[PDB]
Design an enzyme around this catalytic site. Structure first.
Site, short mmCIF file in Angstrom:
data_model
loop_
_atom_site.label_atom_id
_atom_site.label_comp_id
_atom_site.label_asym_id
_atom_site.label_seq_id
_atom_site.Cartn_x
_atom_site.Cartn_y
_atom_site.Cartn_z
N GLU A 1 -3.31 5.01 -9.28
CA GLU A 1 -4.26 5.95 -8.66
C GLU A 1 -3.98 7.23 -9.43
O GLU A 1 -3.12 8.02 -9.06
CB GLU A 1 -4.00 6.16 -7.17
CG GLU A 1 -5.12 6.92 -6.51
CD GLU A 1 -4.71 7.65 -5.26
OE1 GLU A 1 -3.80 8.50 -5.33
OE2 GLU A 1 -5.32 7.41 -4.19
N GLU B 1 1.57 -0.11 -5.73
CA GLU B 1 0.67 1.04 -5.83
C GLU B 1 1.41 2.34 -6.19
O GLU B 1 2.31 2.75 -5.48
CB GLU B 1 -0.05 1.20 -4.51
CG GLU B 1 -1.22 2.13 -4.56
CD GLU B 1 -2.01 2.11 -3.28
OE1 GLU B 1 -1.99 1.07 -2.58
OE2 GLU B 1 -2.64 3.13 -2.95
N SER C 1 -12.73 -2.16 -4.07
CA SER C 1 -11.72 -1.90 -3.05
C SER C 1 -12.41 -1.56 -1.74
O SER C 1 -13.46 -0.93 -1.72
CB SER C 1 -10.83 -0.75 -3.47
OG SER C 1 -10.17 -1.08 -4.68
N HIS D 1 0.85 -1.20 0.00
CA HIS D 1 0.00 0.00 0.00
C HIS D 1 0.88 1.25 0.00
O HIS D 1 1.76 1.37 0.87
CB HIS D 1 -0.89 0.01 1.23
CG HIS D 1 -1.50 1.34 1.53
ND1 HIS D 1 -1.08 2.13 2.57
CD2 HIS D 1 -2.50 2.02 0.92
CE1 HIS D 1 -1.79 3.24 2.59
NE2 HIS D 1 -2.66 3.20 1.60
N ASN D 2 0.63 2.18 -0.93
CA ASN D 2 1.45 3.39 -1.07
C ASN D 2 2.91 2.97 -1.13
O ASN D 2 3.77 3.49 -0.42
CB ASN D 2 1.21 4.33 0.10
CG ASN D 2 -0.03 5.15 -0.07
OD1 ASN D 2 -0.81 4.95 -1.02
ND2 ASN D 2 -0.22 6.11 0.82
N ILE E 1 23.47 -8.50 29.00
CA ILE E 1 22.75 -9.74 28.71
C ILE E 1 21.24 -9.53 28.55
O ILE E 1 20.67 -8.61 29.12
CB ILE E 1 23.03 -10.84 29.78
CG1 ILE E 1 24.54 -10.95 30.06
CG2 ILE E 1 22.58 -12.19 29.26
CD1 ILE E 1 24.92 -11.87 31.20
N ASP F 1 0.63 6.29 -6.77
CA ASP F 1 -0.32 7.41 -6.71
C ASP F 1 0.18 8.46 -7.69
O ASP F 1 1.05 9.27 -7.34
CB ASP F 1 -0.37 8.00 -5.31
CG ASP F 1 -1.14 7.14 -4.33
OD1 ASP F 1 -1.22 5.91 -4.50
OD2 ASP F 1 -1.67 7.70 -3.36
N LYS G 1 -4.03 -1.80 -13.08
CA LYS G 1 -5.33 -1.67 -12.42
C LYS G 1 -5.71 -0.19 -12.37
O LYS G 1 -4.86 0.65 -12.14
CB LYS G 1 -5.26 -2.24 -11.01
CG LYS G 1 -6.55 -2.11 -10.25
CD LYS G 1 -6.29 -1.34 -9.00
CE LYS G 1 -7.56 -0.87 -8.36
NZ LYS G 1 -7.24 -0.11 -7.13
N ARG H 1 -9.66 -5.98 -3.38
CA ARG H 1 -8.53 -5.26 -2.83
C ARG H 1 -8.93 -4.55 -1.55
O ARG H 1 -9.91 -3.81 -1.53
CB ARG H 1 -7.99 -4.27 -3.84
CG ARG H 1 -6.88 -3.44 -3.26
CD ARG H 1 -5.84 -3.06 -4.28
NE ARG H 1 -4.91 -2.14 -3.64
CZ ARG H 1 -5.27 -0.96 -3.16
NH1 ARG H 1 -6.53 -0.56 -3.27
NH2 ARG H 1 -4.39 -0.20 -2.53
N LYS I 1 -9.18 2.95 -13.45
CA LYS I 1 -10.42 3.30 -14.14
C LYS I 1 -10.34 2.93 -15.62
O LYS I 1 -9.25 2.87 -16.20
CB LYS I 1 -10.71 4.80 -13.99
CG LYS I 1 -10.82 5.28 -12.56
CD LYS I 1 -11.88 4.52 -11.78
CE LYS I 1 -11.91 4.94 -10.30
NZ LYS I 1 -12.85 4.11 -9.48
N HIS J 1 2.15 10.94 -2.02
CA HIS J 1 0.83 10.86 -1.39
C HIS J 1 0.22 12.24 -1.40
O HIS J 1 0.46 13.04 -0.49
CB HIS J 1 0.93 10.38 0.04
CG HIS J 1 -0.40 10.18 0.69
ND1 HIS J 1 -0.66 10.57 1.98
CD2 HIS J 1 -1.55 9.64 0.22
CE1 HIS J 1 -1.92 10.28 2.28
NE2 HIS J 1 -2.48 9.71 1.23
N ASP K 1 12.33 -9.70 24.90
CA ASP K 1 13.37 -9.36 25.84
C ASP K 1 12.69 -8.64 26.99
O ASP K 1 12.45 -7.45 26.91
CB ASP K 1 14.40 -8.45 25.14
CG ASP K 1 15.59 -8.13 26.02
OD1 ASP K 1 15.70 -8.71 27.12
OD2 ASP K 1 16.43 -7.30 25.61
SM LIG Z 1 19.30 -8.44 31.34
SM LIG Z 2 -3.15 5.72 -2.65
#
Ligand SMILES: [Sm+3]
Ligand SMILES: [Sm+3]
EC number: 3.1.4.11
Length: 509
Positions: free
Chosen positions: A185, A136, A275, A106-107, A404, A138, A233, A302, A235, A151, A459
């Site tokens: 897009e 994608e 979509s 995406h983007n 550690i 744009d 993909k 999508r 229009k 974007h 951790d």
């Molecule tokens: Sm530790």
């Molecule tokens: Sm977009």
């Protein structure tokens, strides 16, 4: 006498051999078919393993397996918890695109956030190398008659449409020979749309799918029929769009969702693609259920991140997959459990970008519904038992200045609502090198074919939460039983140099 000398590797090897110091081919076939629950387990396999992992030459010539080789196997490709047979393409690839789960970005241009972050071809490269198939772009008007990608209406770095394409051309099939779908897009002016069209055909060239396939007239083609090709993909002329461009939209005509309907009297076509925002998709899967599943059998669907995710955060893709949704777009630039389950699912099938959905999802007349399960081929409950035995050589560069780690392994089952569970071990205070847990967890998985087993290591820290060390997601039907080693991937999906978790896997009916 340190790196080696795995107490538990001794504990499991003596078990095998019995009272001998080496493994006879006969005794091995017993270990493999019984412990390792191997369907191949016979002399021949047992011998391939000896010839492919046995360090001692004599013990290899005299057809036996030493503890060294017993280890060399367990740590190997064959010892892995992820079915090595699946590291290769092995699924039906002649099913319609709507019968596969496409690896989606995406983007893609974005390397960071959605508001002020950078945009880079590096983003399309890195995504394509992670096996992403649906990118994608744009598109917007750029200075001096050259379209740009960014974007729209934000401070996100701008990049050239042509550059982005050269990048896509080069890395498109590095990680897979299967078709890549370029989601466009469009916002460009007609003269700049003409430019886009000229760069597409000029830069991409033969790789582009400019014309339909002869014979494919009632349902989307197959990943095979589209190998090494790229489809667009967007229009498509319903009469603000140049014919040059529109003629390029063949099997992925962008349409607005007008509702479900079933094969009974007309509806969306196999070449059209609706979509959905993560929110809407979740609404329809709740209200329509198998109405949506049936819907995705024939047409591609999508999905895409909500708009409130300016931080480029992701959504769990599983619930989308469970509803048959194939092009579930996630922000690949964002590390997290979501992209973990994402690529993990996609490491399957040789990690070729396309993954054949379970048969019950490719049934146009199926009555399956992930949120309200009934009885059917999907309901086939198993019982997984995972022995988090011993982790080894866990990362520790997360805190450069040496001291550690405080490890703890979280095992979680990702799947249909019911099966969505999680467990974890006790923190092994200060020891990332040779931590031992010997703790077994037990999960009941009603719908296994939609399940993925995720091994995650933390951790423990009262300073800044339990920091992430490494993890590995394995699709249920790709999980191997017996004694296996789980190779830990980094936060970026890059398998750590020598970080693993020794475990014993079990699946009963
Ligand atoms: Sm530790
Ligand atoms: Sm977009």
């Amino acid at each position: 006498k340190m790196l080696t000398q795995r107490a538990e590797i001794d504990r499991a090897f003596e078990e095998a051999a019995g009272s001998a110091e080496t493994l006879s081919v006969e005794r091995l076939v017993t270990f493999l078919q019984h412990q390792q629950r191997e369907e191949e387990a016979g002399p021949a396999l047992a011998l391939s393993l000896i010839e492919r992992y046995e360090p001692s030459e004599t013990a290899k010539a005299q057809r036996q397996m030493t503890k060294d080789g017993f280890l060399m196997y367990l740590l190997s490709a064959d010892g892995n918890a992820f079915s090595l047979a699946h590291r290769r393409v092995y699924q039906d690839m002649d099913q319609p695109l709507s019968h596969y789960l496409v690896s989606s970005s995406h983007n893609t241009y974005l390397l960071e956030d959605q508001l002020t972050g950078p945009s880079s071809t590096e983003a399309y490269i890195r995504a394509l190398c992670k096996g992403c198939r649906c990118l994608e772009l744009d598109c917007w008007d750029g200075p001096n008659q050259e379209p740009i990608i960014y974007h729209g209406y934000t401070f996100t770095s701008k990049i050239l449409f042509c550059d982005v394409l050269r990048a896509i051309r080069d890395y498109a099939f590095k990680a897979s020979p299967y078709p890549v779908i370029l989601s466009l897009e469009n916002h460009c002016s007609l003269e700049q749309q003409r430019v886009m069209a000229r760069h597409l055909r000029a830069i991409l060239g033969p790789i582009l799918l400019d014309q339909p396939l002869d014979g494919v007239t009632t349902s989307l083609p197959s990943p095979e029929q589209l190998k090494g090709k790229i489809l667009l993909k967007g229009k498509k002329l319903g009469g603000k769009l140049v014919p040059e461009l529109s003629d390029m939209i063949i099997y992925c005509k962008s349409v607005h969702f007008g509702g479900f309907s079933s094969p009974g009297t007309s509806g969306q076509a196999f070449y059209e693609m609706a979509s959905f925002s993560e929110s809407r998709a979740l609404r329809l899967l709740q209200e329509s259920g198998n109405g949506f599943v049936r819907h995705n059998v024939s047409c591609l669907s999508r999905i895409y991140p909500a708009g409130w995710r300016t931080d480029s955060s992701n959504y769990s893709p599983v619930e989308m997959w469970n509803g048959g949704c194939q092009i579930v777009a996630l922000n690949f630039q964002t590390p997290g459990p979501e992209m973990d389950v994402y690529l993990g699912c996609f490491q399957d099938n040789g990690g070729c970008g396309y993954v054949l959905k379970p048969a019950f999802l490719r049934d146009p007349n199926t009555t399956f519904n992930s949120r309200a399960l009934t009885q059917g081929p999907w309901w086939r409950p198993e019982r997984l038992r995972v022995r988090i035995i011993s982790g080894q050589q866990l990362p520790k560069v997360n805190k450069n200045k040496n001291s550690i780690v405080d490890p703890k392994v979280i095992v979680e089952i990702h799947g249909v609502g019911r099966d969505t569970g999680s467990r974890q071990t006790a923190v092994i205070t200060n020891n990332g090198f040779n931590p031992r847990w010997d703790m077994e967890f037990e999960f009941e998985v009603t719908v296994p074919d939609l399940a993925l087993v995720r091994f995650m290591v933390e951790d423990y820290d009262s300073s800044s939460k339990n920091d992430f060390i490494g993890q590995s997601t394995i699709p249920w039907n790709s999980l191997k039983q017996g004694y296996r080693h789980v190779h830990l991937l980094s936060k970026n999906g890059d398998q750590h140099p020598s970080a693993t978790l020794f475990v014993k896997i079990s699946i009963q009916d």
